[PDB]
């Protein structure tokens, strides 16, 4: 799957090569360290890709904003906050084939992240040990692929998208436990990205572009329509935003922020604000 | 495209990250040197991954079978024969965004490849300089990709690939330019692999699978047996060899060798001999 690629934007878990079930975990306000993997909001990290550097921020998601950082000149690394030093930026690169990735250093190139035998973290020059290598797992990928989920507006905890009866229109209501709620959640390697299909009638979550931008169910389709981008807030990994792929710059809003039984679902202008945030939970 | 991606086997233009046109070329019995592309064998470089190492020797495809390698002590690098030397190792790693590939040198991972003004080449120290930074361009995808070509058997000049008339059998035939013998081969993205089209009927090369193994012009389908990895032969990139991903140990093949218009175009156990040798022309 392409799903774990490392894209700009995409949260991931960061595992040792030789153990897929420890993961890079902000211990405290501070520290860093491999440790059981719990899904935990503070094991999971947002890549934030400056072009001009052709290098990474490795941002923390539990709500703290710190990023991981080297801690010049000592061989010590930690989360720190953002000062934009040369020795908070990393350069990712993977192998292709291995999938690994090596996590260097951009102050100081000749530095890799290095995990130890004890969990814990540090940077050393590069050797042929894989204790330099590290994996990434998309944290969405890994909890929503393939899973039959309900998405509740922020806006009301009982306000769920539903597709509306007898009519393509999906809008808002509140929970009865029905198909019409219900959505698959599938990848699809071709777009990198999701379709989500309504049980009811096995078709798909799509934006029909008119004045209206309504989502509707759809058939099946090769158009970005129907493609969307799940991620999490930019800084809550306990809520999503759902980007578009015919023009990621709009996601999926509730009209005018209303809360009632019947309330159009449609595809606008991103700005963040609750009518814009879903909470998707497992069937 | 997922079409350039680092994979075991595939042959790419090697050129600075900055200027696509310069690319890597054996100017000698031993030496290389940047020179403006001009796509011949002598600029082609194939992979060859090593699972223990994870890391990659670069065969050049001019049918000596030399391979890129670091003249430690010194800096500079050379081909020569295959001695399975450390210093004939590279560790491919790659910028997922940029695309950029550090071609580093398994001996001693603290040097990695550079360019210099004068279009020689070099390992040294990591920086954090363009200089040190190539990307991999997959031949193949460069000179194929939807494209409207002919196919000839290498067995007798004048012998194509042909759908046959009234017929979805595929057979040898001389070429009298027809629409029957015309293929736009095009990359699948799905199935990272080529598809191609019939130009008289808009059906694919497809593998029909019973004792005969015909090959015939099929309907559009996910199935494998109508993907096809097109690569060069494996010491001489002015022909080809056509890979089923059915069965990647078997190949496009021409019955027994014969040549007469008519014979029947398969998919048989790869042997490499010429019956299973293409030539592909753009029209």
């Given at each position: 799957?392409?799903?774990?690629?490392?894209?700009?934007?995409?949260?991931?878990?960061?595992?040792?090569?030789?153990?897929?079930?420890?993961?890079?975990?902000?211990?405290?306000?501070?520290?860093?360290?491999?440790?059981?993997?719990?899904?935990?909001?503070?094991?999971?990290?947002?890549?934030?890709?400056?072009?001009?550097?052709?290098?990474?921020?490795?941002?923390?998601?539990?709500?703290?904003?710190?990023?991981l950082t080297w801690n010049a000149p000592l061989s010590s690394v930690s989360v720190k906050t953002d000062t934009n030093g040369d020795n908070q930026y990393w350069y990712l690169l993977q192998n292709y084939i291995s999938r690994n990735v090596i996590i260097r250093n951009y102050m100081n190139?000749?530095?890799?992240?290095?995990?130890?035998?004890?969990?814990?973290?540090?940077?050393?020059?590069?050797?042929?040990?894989?204790?330099?290598?590290?994996?990434?797992?998309?944290?969405?990928?890994?909890?929503?692929?393939?899973?039959?989920?309900?998405?509740?507006?922020?806006?009301?905890?009982?306000?769920?998208?539903?597709?509306?009866?007898?009519?393509?229109?999906?809008?808002?209501?509140?929970?009865?436990?029905?198909?019409?709620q219900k959505w698959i959640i599938e990848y699809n390697e071709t777009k990198s990205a999701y379709t989500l299909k309504c049980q009811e009638n096995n078709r798909y979550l799509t934006w029909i572009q008119n004045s209206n931008n309504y989502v509707e169910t759809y058939q099946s389709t090769d158009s970005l329509i129907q493609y969307w981008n799940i991620n999490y807030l930019d800084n809550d990994a306990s809520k999503y935003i759902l980007y578009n792929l015919q023009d990621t710059n709009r996601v999926l809003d509730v009209y005018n922020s209303q809360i009632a039984n019947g309330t159009h679902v449609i595809v606008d202008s991103y700005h963040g604000n609750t009518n814009q945030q879903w909470i998707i939970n497992l069937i």
């Open positions: 799957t392409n799903a774990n690629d490392l894209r700009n934007n995409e949260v991931f878990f960061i595992s040792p090569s030789n153990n897929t079930n420890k993961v890079l975990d902000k211990i405290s306000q501070s520290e860093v360290k491999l440790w059981n993997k719990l899904s935990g909001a503070n094991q999971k990290w947002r890549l934030i890709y400056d072009t001009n550097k052709q290098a990474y921020k490795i941002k923390v998601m539990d709500n703290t904003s710190l990023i190139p000749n530095l890799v992240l290095q995990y130890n035998i004890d969990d814990t973290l540090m940077v050393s020059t590069q050797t042929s040990s894989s204790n330099q290598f590290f994996k990434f797992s998309n944290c969405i990928y890994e909890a929503l692929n393939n899973r039959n989920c309900k998405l509740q507006t922020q806006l009301n905890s009982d306000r769920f998208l539903s597709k509306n009866l007898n009519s393509q229109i999906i809008v808002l209501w509140q929970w009865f436990d029905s198909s019409r």
